[PDB]
Structures are given as structure tokens and as C-alpha cells.
Amino acid sequence: GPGSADASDWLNRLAEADRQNSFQGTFVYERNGSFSTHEIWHRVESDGAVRERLLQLDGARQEVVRVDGRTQCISGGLADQLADAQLWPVRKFDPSQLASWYDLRLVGESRVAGRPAVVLAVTPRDQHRYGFELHLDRDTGLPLKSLLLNEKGQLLERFQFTQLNTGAAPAEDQLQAGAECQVVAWRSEWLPPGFTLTRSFMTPDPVACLTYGDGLARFSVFIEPLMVGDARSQLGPTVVVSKRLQTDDGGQMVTVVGEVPLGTAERVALSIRPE
């Protein structure tokens, strides 16, 4: 868990940050050498719903609108939506859940997006998960920068804001996507310790998704049925494993993405069972 009272307070401020701040900002995402830039609008509405829109600023015009974690509309093909399931610049953390699996040390202060921030070094307590370096907004607790690091200290993933405006909630129109944003049963029998199912949900073909988290890390497993002789291997750079598996409910294309070591991802995928 946290290694000082300071780390504890800041961990706490982090967990509150998602449901208590409205903001607009732009950030960079990098995962295993990929590079993309995104604008985000995030607003706590009247009924406390957390409403969110992401717009990819480069590459293909791609958008996602979420309400309390549930996606209202999304853009593009399958691989795009894989990339989206990982686009969680500001997520809900669960300090009590995560404290069993990580040690958290206050390193000092920093600057991100021109704002004062606080730095936590987050170290795993086993080899089933990666470490993080987290930079928390001094003012709001929001995660300005997140570095995913392996045991050898190599950078595997970067979330990093380039600008953040927490001074006034976005207007209604800023929370709405465009016409290209399209409207709108399995289990893992092995999970790494501490991981629980965060979320499950279901374009060219029907695909099931399971997102898992340990209070800190997030990874997702996509299960795509089957054409049977013409399988689609996900070949994106953020893909951790993509396997064709034979289950008791037929052939599945199983793809794991997110913040999860390869060996761990492989064990999860191989444990996927129908219900």
C-alpha cells in the first residue's frame, strides 16, 4: 500500500478526482510505440452522471462518448474500439483494492501541461502486473501523466496531458459527437490476484468484451466468434496477445489489450470459457 501518509492522502485525492471534477483537456497516448493525440471533455451533470467525450485529433476522425463508463456511441472498426477500451486517461481508482497489490511511494513534485503536480512511484507486489509512475494534478488530483513501466524500468505506455482546463465545465455542445460516431456471456476462469471484472459489453461482426481491473491497472479481453477459415488476427501495436481458441461454443478470436504482462495475458486468454 501507500508508504507514507503523504502517499495515502494523494492516493485518496486521485480516487475522488473522476467524479468530482469537470474539465476539458488534450493528451497524448503512446502504447508500445504507437502514438495518438486526443481531446477530452468531461463533465459531471446534474444527476451526478459522469459524462465524457473523446476525440482523436490526428489520424482517422474517431470519437467516443461514455456515460458512467458505458459507451453511448463509438467510431470506426474493431481495432479502433480495441484502442478505445484502453483510452482511459481519467479512470476510477479503488485505493483499498489496489493497496494489496502495490506499494506507493511519494517521489516529489513535477510539472505536467504547465501545472504543478505530485509524483507517486507505484510498485507491484508481485509479477502478475506492471508498475506505474503517476503525476497527480496538485489542484484537482486528476492524473496528468501516467507511465506504465516493466520490471526492467522500460516505458510501455504513456498517458500525458498537454493542456488541461479545470476552471469551468464544458458546454453541452462540447460533450456531443458527430454523425460518424455510431450508436451503442463469457468468463475468465483464471485472473491474476486482485483483478475483478470492471465491465462487459458487446461492429462488422458481434464481439464480446471483458474489462478487468485491480483498482489501478486495467486490461480488456475481446472475444470474436469464428468467417471460420478467414480469421482476423488483431495485428495492432497495442495488442498483447491475439489467439484463435476453440471453445465449447465454437471458434473464437481472442484478443487481450491493456496494462498486463504478456505471460499474464496469455494465461487469461487460455482460461476464457463460455457460460
PDB file of C-alpha atoms in Angstrom:
ATOM      1  CA  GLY A   1       0.000   0.000   0.000  1.00  0.00           C
ATOM      2  CA  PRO A   2       1.000   3.659   0.334  1.00  0.00           C
ATOM      3  CA  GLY A   3       4.373   4.053   2.014  1.00  0.00           C
ATOM      4  CA  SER A   4       3.672   7.299   3.802  1.00  0.00           C
ATOM      5  CA  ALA A   5       0.779   9.421   4.956  1.00  0.00           C
ATOM      6  CA  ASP A   6       1.574  11.781   2.069  1.00  0.00           C
ATOM      7  CA  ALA A   7       1.214   8.987  -0.499  1.00  0.00           C
ATOM      8  CA  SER A   8      -2.005   7.970   1.247  1.00  0.00           C
ATOM      9  CA  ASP A   9      -3.560  11.457   1.017  1.00  0.00           C
ATOM     10  CA  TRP A  10      -2.589  11.807  -2.636  1.00  0.00           C
ATOM     11  CA  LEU A  11      -3.827   8.330  -3.463  1.00  0.00           C
ATOM     12  CA  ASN A  12      -7.132   9.387  -1.882  1.00  0.00           C
ATOM     13  CA  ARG A  13      -7.287  12.629  -3.837  1.00  0.00           C
ATOM     14  CA  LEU A  14      -6.695  10.600  -7.003  1.00  0.00           C
ATOM     15  CA  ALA A  15      -9.649   8.305  -6.369  1.00  0.00           C
ATOM     16  CA  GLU A  16     -12.019  11.249  -5.871  1.00  0.00           C
ATOM     17  CA  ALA A  17     -10.834  13.071  -8.956  1.00  0.00           C
ATOM     18  CA  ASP A  18     -13.024  11.406 -11.602  1.00  0.00           C
ATOM     19  CA  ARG A  19     -16.460  12.066 -10.117  1.00  0.00           C
ATOM     20  CA  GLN A  20     -15.686  15.468  -8.652  1.00  0.00           C
ATOM     21  CA  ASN A  21     -14.141  17.433 -11.490  1.00  0.00           C
ATOM     22  CA  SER A  22     -15.398  18.753 -14.785  1.00  0.00           C
ATOM     23  CA  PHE A  23     -12.693  19.576 -17.295  1.00  0.00           C
ATOM     24  CA  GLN A  24     -11.532  19.937 -20.870  1.00  0.00           C
ATOM     25  CA  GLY A  25      -8.070  18.885 -21.955  1.00  0.00           C
ATOM     26  CA  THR A  26      -5.846  17.344 -24.587  1.00  0.00           C
ATOM     27  CA  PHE A  27      -3.475  14.429 -24.088  1.00  0.00           C
ATOM     28  CA  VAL A  28      -1.002  12.148 -25.837  1.00  0.00           C
ATOM     29  CA  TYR A  29      -1.385   8.396 -25.797  1.00  0.00           C
ATOM     30  CA  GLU A  30       1.505   6.065 -26.519  1.00  0.00           C
ATOM     31  CA  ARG A  31       1.395   2.317 -26.163  1.00  0.00           C
ATOM     32  CA  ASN A  32       4.249   0.104 -27.279  1.00  0.00           C
ATOM     33  CA  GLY A  33       5.438   2.697 -29.778  1.00  0.00           C
ATOM     34  CA  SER A  34       2.035   3.765 -31.095  1.00  0.00           C
ATOM     35  CA  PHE A  35       1.247   7.488 -30.995  1.00  0.00           C
ATOM     36  CA  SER A  36      -2.035   9.359 -30.938  1.00  0.00           C
ATOM     37  CA  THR A  37      -3.438  12.647 -29.701  1.00  0.00           C
ATOM     38  CA  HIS A  38      -6.868  13.121 -28.139  1.00  0.00           C
ATOM     39  CA  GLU A  39      -9.091  15.869 -26.835  1.00  0.00           C
ATOM     40  CA  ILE A  40     -11.322  15.074 -23.907  1.00  0.00           C
ATOM     41  CA  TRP A  41     -14.381  16.728 -22.408  1.00  0.00           C
ATOM     42  CA  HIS A  42     -15.528  15.511 -19.058  1.00  0.00           C
ATOM     43  CA  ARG A  43     -18.498  16.810 -17.141  1.00  0.00           C
ATOM     44  CA  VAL A  44     -20.347  15.881 -14.009  1.00  0.00           C
ATOM     45  CA  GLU A  45     -24.000  16.518 -14.887  1.00  0.00           C
ATOM     46  CA  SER A  46     -26.855  17.498 -12.557  1.00  0.00           C
ATOM     47  CA  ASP A  47     -27.737  13.918 -11.545  1.00  0.00           C
ATOM     48  CA  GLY A  48     -24.093  13.106 -10.863  1.00  0.00           C
ATOM     49  CA  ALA A  49     -23.686  11.090 -14.043  1.00  0.00           C
ATOM     50  CA  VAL A  50     -20.143  11.288 -15.270  1.00  0.00           C
ATOM     51  CA  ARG A  51     -20.323  12.186 -18.972  1.00  0.00           C
ATOM     52  CA  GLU A  52     -17.354  12.008 -21.286  1.00  0.00           C
ATOM     53  CA  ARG A  53     -16.389  12.615 -24.904  1.00  0.00           C
ATOM     54  CA  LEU A  54     -13.066  11.705 -26.529  1.00  0.00           C
ATOM     55  CA  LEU A  55     -11.973  12.974 -29.962  1.00  0.00           C
ATOM     56  CA  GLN A  56      -8.841  11.680 -31.674  1.00  0.00           C
ATOM     57  CA  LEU A  57      -7.172  14.833 -33.033  1.00  0.00           C
ATOM     58  CA  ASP A  58      -4.962  13.103 -35.541  1.00  0.00           C
ATOM     59  CA  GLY A  59      -5.301  10.049 -37.753  1.00  0.00           C
ATOM     60  CA  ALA A  60      -8.828   8.996 -38.589  1.00  0.00           C
ATOM     61  CA  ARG A  61     -11.600  11.146 -37.171  1.00  0.00           C
ATOM     62  CA  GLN A  62     -12.642   8.877 -34.326  1.00  0.00           C
ATOM     63  CA  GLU A  63     -14.912   9.656 -31.336  1.00  0.00           C
ATOM     64  CA  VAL A  64     -16.226   8.005 -28.174  1.00  0.00           C
ATOM     65  CA  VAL A  65     -18.978   9.155 -25.819  1.00  0.00           C
ATOM     66  CA  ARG A  66     -19.306   7.426 -22.427  1.00  0.00           C
ATOM     67  CA  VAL A  67     -21.766   7.851 -19.558  1.00  0.00           C
ATOM     68  CA  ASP A  68     -20.576   6.493 -16.201  1.00  0.00           C
ATOM     69  CA  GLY A  69     -18.230   4.181 -18.055  1.00  0.00           C
ATOM     70  CA  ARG A  70     -20.846   2.947 -20.521  1.00  0.00           C
ATOM     71  CA  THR A  71     -20.308   3.840 -24.164  1.00  0.00           C
ATOM     72  CA  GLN A  72     -23.152   5.699 -25.932  1.00  0.00           C
ATOM     73  CA  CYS A  73     -21.557   5.925 -29.350  1.00  0.00           C
ATOM     74  CA  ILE A  74     -18.221   4.891 -30.884  1.00  0.00           C
ATOM     75  CA  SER A  75     -16.264   5.358 -34.153  1.00  0.00           C
ATOM     76  CA  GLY A  76     -14.661   3.064 -36.674  1.00  0.00           C
ATOM     77  CA  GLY A  77     -13.691  -0.574 -36.945  1.00  0.00           C
ATOM     78  CA  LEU A  78     -12.745  -3.280 -34.496  1.00  0.00           C
ATOM     79  CA  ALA A  79      -9.143  -2.266 -33.955  1.00  0.00           C
ATOM     80  CA  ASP A  80     -10.261   1.280 -33.307  1.00  0.00           C
ATOM     81  CA  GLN A  81     -12.537   0.010 -30.480  1.00  0.00           C
ATOM     82  CA  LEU A  82      -9.693  -2.030 -29.033  1.00  0.00           C
ATOM     83  CA  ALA A  83      -7.721   1.167 -28.871  1.00  0.00           C
ATOM     84  CA  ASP A  84     -10.709   2.827 -27.177  1.00  0.00           C
ATOM     85  CA  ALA A  85     -11.122   0.209 -24.457  1.00  0.00           C
ATOM     86  CA  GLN A  86      -7.653   1.299 -23.312  1.00  0.00           C
ATOM     87  CA  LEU A  87      -8.189   5.033 -23.660  1.00  0.00           C
ATOM     88  CA  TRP A  88      -8.801   5.741 -20.001  1.00  0.00           C
ATOM     89  CA  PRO A  89      -6.818   8.902 -19.280  1.00  0.00           C
ATOM     90  CA  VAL A  90      -9.016   9.505 -16.248  1.00  0.00           C
ATOM     91  CA  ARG A  91     -10.371   6.363 -14.695  1.00  0.00           C
ATOM     92  CA  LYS A  92     -11.903   5.369 -11.381  1.00  0.00           C
ATOM     93  CA  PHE A  93      -9.267   4.080  -8.988  1.00  0.00           C
ATOM     94  CA  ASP A  94     -10.022   1.940  -5.957  1.00  0.00           C
ATOM     95  CA  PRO A  95      -7.315   2.587  -3.367  1.00  0.00           C
ATOM     96  CA  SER A  96      -8.489  -0.105  -0.952  1.00  0.00           C
ATOM     97  CA  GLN A  97      -8.487  -2.668  -3.782  1.00  0.00           C
ATOM     98  CA  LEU A  98      -5.111  -1.671  -5.173  1.00  0.00           C
ATOM     99  CA  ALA A  99      -3.274  -1.317  -1.851  1.00  0.00           C
ATOM    100  CA  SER A 100      -2.912  -5.086  -1.504  1.00  0.00           C
ATOM    101  CA  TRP A 101      -1.031  -5.369  -4.812  1.00  0.00           C
ATOM    102  CA  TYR A 102       1.136  -2.264  -4.953  1.00  0.00           C
ATOM    103  CA  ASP A 103       3.485  -0.249  -2.779  1.00  0.00           C
ATOM    104  CA  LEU A 104       3.098   3.503  -3.319  1.00  0.00           C
ATOM    105  CA  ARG A 105       5.864   5.963  -2.691  1.00  0.00           C
ATOM    106  CA  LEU A 106       5.753   9.745  -2.834  1.00  0.00           C
ATOM    107  CA  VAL A 107       8.687  10.779  -5.057  1.00  0.00           C
ATOM    108  CA  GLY A 108       8.206  14.540  -5.175  1.00  0.00           C
ATOM    109  CA  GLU A 109       6.582  17.227  -7.318  1.00  0.00           C
ATOM    110  CA  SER A 110       6.585  17.846 -11.057  1.00  0.00           C
ATOM    111  CA  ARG A 111       5.097  19.885 -13.891  1.00  0.00           C
ATOM    112  CA  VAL A 112       2.683  18.491 -16.485  1.00  0.00           C
ATOM    113  CA  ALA A 113       0.725  20.560 -19.012  1.00  0.00           C
ATOM    114  CA  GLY A 114       2.122  23.665 -17.328  1.00  0.00           C
ATOM    115  CA  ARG A 115       0.575  22.706 -13.959  1.00  0.00           C
ATOM    116  CA  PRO A 116       2.116  21.786 -10.566  1.00  0.00           C
ATOM    117  CA  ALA A 117       1.759  18.088  -9.858  1.00  0.00           C
ATOM    118  CA  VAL A 118       2.684  15.381  -7.320  1.00  0.00           C
ATOM    119  CA  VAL A 119       4.594  12.198  -8.211  1.00  0.00           C
ATOM    120  CA  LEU A 120       3.893   8.707  -6.932  1.00  0.00           C
ATOM    121  CA  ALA A 121       6.045   5.698  -7.745  1.00  0.00           C
ATOM    122  CA  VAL A 122       3.764   2.692  -7.747  1.00  0.00           C
ATOM    123  CA  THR A 123       5.499  -0.661  -7.480  1.00  0.00           C
ATOM    124  CA  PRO A 124       3.804  -4.047  -7.905  1.00  0.00           C
ATOM    125  CA  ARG A 125       3.925  -6.540  -5.036  1.00  0.00           C
ATOM    126  CA  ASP A 126       4.133  -9.473  -7.477  1.00  0.00           C
ATOM    127  CA  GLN A 127       4.965 -10.294 -11.103  1.00  0.00           C
ATOM    128  CA  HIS A 128       1.376 -10.505 -12.383  1.00  0.00           C
ATOM    129  CA  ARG A 129       1.213  -6.751 -13.043  1.00  0.00           C
ATOM    130  CA  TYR A 130       3.332  -3.785 -14.119  1.00  0.00           C
ATOM    131  CA  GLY A 131       4.430  -0.699 -12.213  1.00  0.00           C
ATOM    132  CA  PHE A 132       3.384   2.943 -12.696  1.00  0.00           C
ATOM    133  CA  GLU A 133       4.752   6.416 -12.233  1.00  0.00           C
ATOM    134  CA  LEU A 134       1.772   8.717 -11.661  1.00  0.00           C
ATOM    135  CA  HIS A 135       1.689  12.511 -11.745  1.00  0.00           C
ATOM    136  CA  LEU A 136      -1.362  13.901  -9.962  1.00  0.00           C
ATOM    137  CA  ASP A 137      -2.704  17.399 -10.566  1.00  0.00           C
ATOM    138  CA  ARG A 138      -1.957  19.399  -7.420  1.00  0.00           C
ATOM    139  CA  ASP A 139      -5.199  21.337  -7.677  1.00  0.00           C
ATOM    140  CA  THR A 140      -7.667  18.570  -8.541  1.00  0.00           C
ATOM    141  CA  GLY A 141      -5.955  15.226  -8.039  1.00  0.00           C
ATOM    142  CA  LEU A 142      -6.502  14.328 -11.716  1.00  0.00           C
ATOM    143  CA  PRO A 143      -3.804  12.096 -13.274  1.00  0.00           C
ATOM    144  CA  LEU A 144      -1.861  14.424 -15.586  1.00  0.00           C
ATOM    145  CA  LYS A 145       0.697  11.794 -16.515  1.00  0.00           C
ATOM    146  CA  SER A 146       0.791   8.023 -16.274  1.00  0.00           C
ATOM    147  CA  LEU A 147       3.862   5.949 -17.179  1.00  0.00           C
ATOM    148  CA  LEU A 148       3.482   2.169 -17.354  1.00  0.00           C
ATOM    149  CA  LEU A 149       6.826   0.550 -16.515  1.00  0.00           C
ATOM    150  CA  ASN A 150       8.048  -3.047 -16.661  1.00  0.00           C
ATOM    151  CA  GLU A 151      10.345  -4.783 -14.206  1.00  0.00           C
ATOM    152  CA  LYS A 152      13.345  -3.536 -16.190  1.00  0.00           C
ATOM    153  CA  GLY A 153      12.026   0.022 -15.946  1.00  0.00           C
ATOM    154  CA  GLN A 154      11.209   0.335 -19.650  1.00  0.00           C
ATOM    155  CA  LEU A 155       8.300   2.629 -20.652  1.00  0.00           C
ATOM    156  CA  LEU A 156       5.386   0.620 -22.128  1.00  0.00           C
ATOM    157  CA  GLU A 157       2.562   3.146 -22.085  1.00  0.00           C
ATOM    158  CA  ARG A 158       2.204   6.869 -21.656  1.00  0.00           C
ATOM    159  CA  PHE A 159      -0.865   8.982 -20.909  1.00  0.00           C
ATOM    160  CA  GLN A 160       0.128  12.617 -20.798  1.00  0.00           C
ATOM    161  CA  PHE A 161      -1.904  15.795 -20.877  1.00  0.00           C
ATOM    162  CA  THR A 162      -0.532  18.668 -22.908  1.00  0.00           C
ATOM    163  CA  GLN A 163      -3.229  21.059 -21.698  1.00  0.00           C
ATOM    164  CA  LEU A 164      -5.859  20.877 -19.004  1.00  0.00           C
ATOM    165  CA  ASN A 165      -8.640  23.331 -18.199  1.00  0.00           C
ATOM    166  CA  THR A 166     -10.394  22.663 -14.898  1.00  0.00           C
ATOM    167  CA  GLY A 167     -11.732  26.193 -14.494  1.00  0.00           C
ATOM    168  CA  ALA A 168     -15.196  25.838 -15.984  1.00  0.00           C
ATOM    169  CA  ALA A 169     -17.295  22.853 -17.015  1.00  0.00           C
ATOM    170  CA  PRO A 170     -17.551  22.181 -20.763  1.00  0.00           C
ATOM    171  CA  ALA A 171     -20.700  23.431 -22.501  1.00  0.00           C
ATOM    172  CA  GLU A 172     -23.348  20.912 -23.575  1.00  0.00           C
ATOM    173  CA  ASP A 173     -22.366  21.071 -27.258  1.00  0.00           C
ATOM    174  CA  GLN A 174     -18.792  20.147 -26.410  1.00  0.00           C
ATOM    175  CA  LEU A 175     -19.996  16.865 -24.993  1.00  0.00           C
ATOM    176  CA  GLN A 176     -21.658  15.788 -28.251  1.00  0.00           C
ATOM    177  CA  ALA A 177     -20.104  13.708 -31.009  1.00  0.00           C
ATOM    178  CA  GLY A 178     -20.769  13.791 -34.751  1.00  0.00           C
ATOM    179  CA  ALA A 179     -22.512  11.556 -37.278  1.00  0.00           C
ATOM    180  CA  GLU A 180     -19.503   9.270 -37.658  1.00  0.00           C
ATOM    181  CA  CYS A 181     -19.893   8.163 -34.028  1.00  0.00           C
ATOM    182  CA  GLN A 182     -22.136   5.073 -34.242  1.00  0.00           C
ATOM    183  CA  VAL A 183     -24.914   4.431 -31.699  1.00  0.00           C
ATOM    184  CA  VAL A 184     -24.338   1.804 -28.974  1.00  0.00           C
ATOM    185  CA  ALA A 185     -21.755 -14.104 -21.862  1.00  0.00           C
ATOM    186  CA  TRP A 186     -18.165 -15.251 -21.292  1.00  0.00           C
ATOM    187  CA  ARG A 187     -15.801 -15.601 -18.375  1.00  0.00           C
ATOM    188  CA  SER A 188     -12.113 -15.846 -17.481  1.00  0.00           C
ATOM    189  CA  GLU A 189     -11.524 -18.826 -15.186  1.00  0.00           C
ATOM    190  CA  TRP A 190      -8.104 -17.502 -14.310  1.00  0.00           C
ATOM    191  CA  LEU A 191      -7.444 -13.930 -13.209  1.00  0.00           C
ATOM    192  CA  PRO A 192      -4.292 -12.503 -11.656  1.00  0.00           C
ATOM    193  CA  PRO A 193      -4.871 -11.870  -7.944  1.00  0.00           C
ATOM    194  CA  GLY A 194      -6.908  -8.790  -7.069  1.00  0.00           C
ATOM    195  CA  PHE A 195      -8.366  -8.371 -10.533  1.00  0.00           C
ATOM    196  CA  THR A 196     -12.143  -8.244 -10.788  1.00  0.00           C
ATOM    197  CA  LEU A 197     -14.489  -7.684 -13.730  1.00  0.00           C
ATOM    198  CA  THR A 198     -14.895  -3.968 -14.240  1.00  0.00           C
ATOM    199  CA  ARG A 199     -17.182  -4.030 -17.219  1.00  0.00           C
ATOM    200  CA  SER A 200     -18.585  -6.181 -20.010  1.00  0.00           C
ATOM    201  CA  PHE A 201     -20.174  -5.108 -23.309  1.00  0.00           C
ATOM    202  CA  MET A 202     -20.820  -6.240 -26.896  1.00  0.00           C
ATOM    203  CA  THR A 203     -19.209  -3.589 -35.482  1.00  0.00           C
ATOM    204  CA  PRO A 204     -18.598  -5.647 -38.640  1.00  0.00           C
ATOM    205  CA  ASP A 205     -19.329  -8.769 -36.566  1.00  0.00           C
ATOM    206  CA  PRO A 206     -20.604  -9.381 -32.999  1.00  0.00           C
ATOM    207  CA  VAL A 207     -17.795  -9.041 -30.449  1.00  0.00           C
ATOM    208  CA  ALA A 208     -17.858  -9.532 -26.671  1.00  0.00           C
ATOM    209  CA  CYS A 209     -15.543  -7.575 -24.330  1.00  0.00           C
ATOM    210  CA  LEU A 210     -14.472  -8.077 -20.724  1.00  0.00           C
ATOM    211  CA  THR A 211     -12.549  -5.351 -18.910  1.00  0.00           C
ATOM    212  CA  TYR A 212     -10.719  -6.274 -15.702  1.00  0.00           C
ATOM    213  CA  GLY A 213      -9.010  -4.088 -13.110  1.00  0.00           C
ATOM    214  CA  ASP A 214      -7.189  -4.372  -9.802  1.00  0.00           C
ATOM    215  CA  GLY A 215      -8.153  -0.870  -8.682  1.00  0.00           C
ATOM    216  CA  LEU A 216      -5.226   0.563 -10.624  1.00  0.00           C
ATOM    217  CA  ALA A 217      -4.361  -1.346 -13.811  1.00  0.00           C
ATOM    218  CA  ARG A 218      -6.961  -2.094 -16.496  1.00  0.00           C
ATOM    219  CA  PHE A 219      -6.871  -4.711 -19.271  1.00  0.00           C
ATOM    220  CA  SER A 220      -9.502  -5.998 -21.674  1.00  0.00           C
ATOM    221  CA  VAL A 221     -10.249  -9.270 -23.412  1.00  0.00           C
ATOM    222  CA  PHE A 222     -12.121  -9.268 -26.747  1.00  0.00           C
ATOM    223  CA  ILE A 223     -13.883 -12.443 -27.885  1.00  0.00           C
ATOM    224  CA  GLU A 224     -14.820 -12.622 -31.532  1.00  0.00           C
ATOM    225  CA  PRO A 225     -16.827 -15.621 -32.879  1.00  0.00           C
ATOM    226  CA  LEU A 226     -15.347 -17.584 -35.807  1.00  0.00           C
ATOM    227  CA  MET A 227     -15.604 -16.319 -41.348  1.00  0.00           C
ATOM    228  CA  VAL A 228     -14.294 -19.604 -39.952  1.00  0.00           C
ATOM    229  CA  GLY A 229     -11.486 -20.190 -42.449  1.00  0.00           C
ATOM    230  CA  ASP A 230     -10.791 -16.471 -42.723  1.00  0.00           C
ATOM    231  CA  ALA A 231      -9.835 -15.435 -39.192  1.00  0.00           C
ATOM    232  CA  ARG A 232      -8.940 -11.865 -38.280  1.00  0.00           C
ATOM    233  CA  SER A 233      -5.787 -11.669 -36.161  1.00  0.00           C
ATOM    234  CA  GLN A 234      -5.637  -8.298 -34.441  1.00  0.00           C
ATOM    235  CA  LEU A 235      -2.238  -7.017 -35.550  1.00  0.00           C
ATOM    236  CA  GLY A 236      -2.298  -3.615 -33.889  1.00  0.00           C
ATOM    237  CA  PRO A 237       0.762  -2.500 -31.916  1.00  0.00           C
ATOM    238  CA  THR A 238      -1.141  -2.319 -28.633  1.00  0.00           C
ATOM    239  CA  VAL A 239      -2.227  -5.973 -28.866  1.00  0.00           C
ATOM    240  CA  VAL A 240      -0.685  -8.034 -26.067  1.00  0.00           C
ATOM    241  CA  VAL A 241      -1.987 -11.430 -27.254  1.00  0.00           C
ATOM    242  CA  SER A 242      -4.283 -12.398 -30.119  1.00  0.00           C
ATOM    243  CA  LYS A 243      -5.147 -16.093 -30.216  1.00  0.00           C
ATOM    244  CA  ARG A 244      -7.660 -18.240 -32.048  1.00  0.00           C
ATOM    245  CA  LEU A 245      -9.208 -20.500 -29.458  1.00  0.00           C
ATOM    246  CA  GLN A 246     -11.533 -23.431 -29.723  1.00  0.00           C
ATOM    247  CA  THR A 247     -14.186 -23.384 -27.037  1.00  0.00           C
ATOM    248  CA  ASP A 248     -17.309 -25.377 -26.275  1.00  0.00           C
ATOM    249  CA  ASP A 249     -19.119 -22.580 -28.075  1.00  0.00           C
ATOM    250  CA  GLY A 250     -17.025 -22.794 -31.239  1.00  0.00           C
ATOM    251  CA  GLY A 251     -14.017 -20.935 -32.604  1.00  0.00           C
ATOM    252  CA  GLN A 252     -13.180 -17.583 -31.048  1.00  0.00           C
ATOM    253  CA  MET A 253     -10.698 -14.872 -31.922  1.00  0.00           C
ATOM    254  CA  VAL A 254      -9.394 -13.831 -28.508  1.00  0.00           C
ATOM    255  CA  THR A 255      -7.517 -10.552 -28.150  1.00  0.00           C
ATOM    256  CA  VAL A 256      -6.049  -9.141 -24.937  1.00  0.00           C
ATOM    257  CA  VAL A 257      -5.079  -5.480 -24.759  1.00  0.00           C
ATOM    258  CA  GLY A 258      -4.143  -3.122 -21.950  1.00  0.00           C
ATOM    259  CA  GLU A 259      -1.932  -2.896 -18.905  1.00  0.00           C
ATOM    260  CA  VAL A 260      -0.997  -6.543 -18.462  1.00  0.00           C
ATOM    261  CA  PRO A 261       2.220  -8.551 -18.841  1.00  0.00           C
ATOM    262  CA  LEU A 262       2.397 -10.975 -21.758  1.00  0.00           C
ATOM    263  CA  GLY A 263       2.601 -14.144 -19.674  1.00  0.00           C
ATOM    264  CA  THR A 264      -0.358 -12.981 -17.618  1.00  0.00           C
ATOM    265  CA  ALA A 265      -2.392 -12.076 -20.699  1.00  0.00           C
ATOM    266  CA  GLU A 266      -1.661 -15.489 -22.183  1.00  0.00           C
ATOM    267  CA  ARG A 267      -2.918 -17.231 -19.053  1.00  0.00           C
ATOM    268  CA  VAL A 268      -6.103 -15.165 -19.019  1.00  0.00           C
ATOM    269  CA  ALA A 269      -6.882 -15.779 -22.702  1.00  0.00           C
ATOM    270  CA  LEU A 270      -6.345 -19.529 -22.394  1.00  0.00           C
ATOM    271  CA  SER A 271      -8.774 -19.603 -19.465  1.00  0.00           C
ATOM    272  CA  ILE A 272     -11.637 -17.978 -21.343  1.00  0.00           C
ATOM    273  CA  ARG A 273     -14.783 -20.146 -21.145  1.00  0.00           C
ATOM    274  CA  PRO A 274     -18.360 -19.696 -22.363  1.00  0.00           C
ATOM    275  CA  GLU A 275     -21.280 -19.706 -19.965  1.00  0.00           C
TER     276      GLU A 275
END
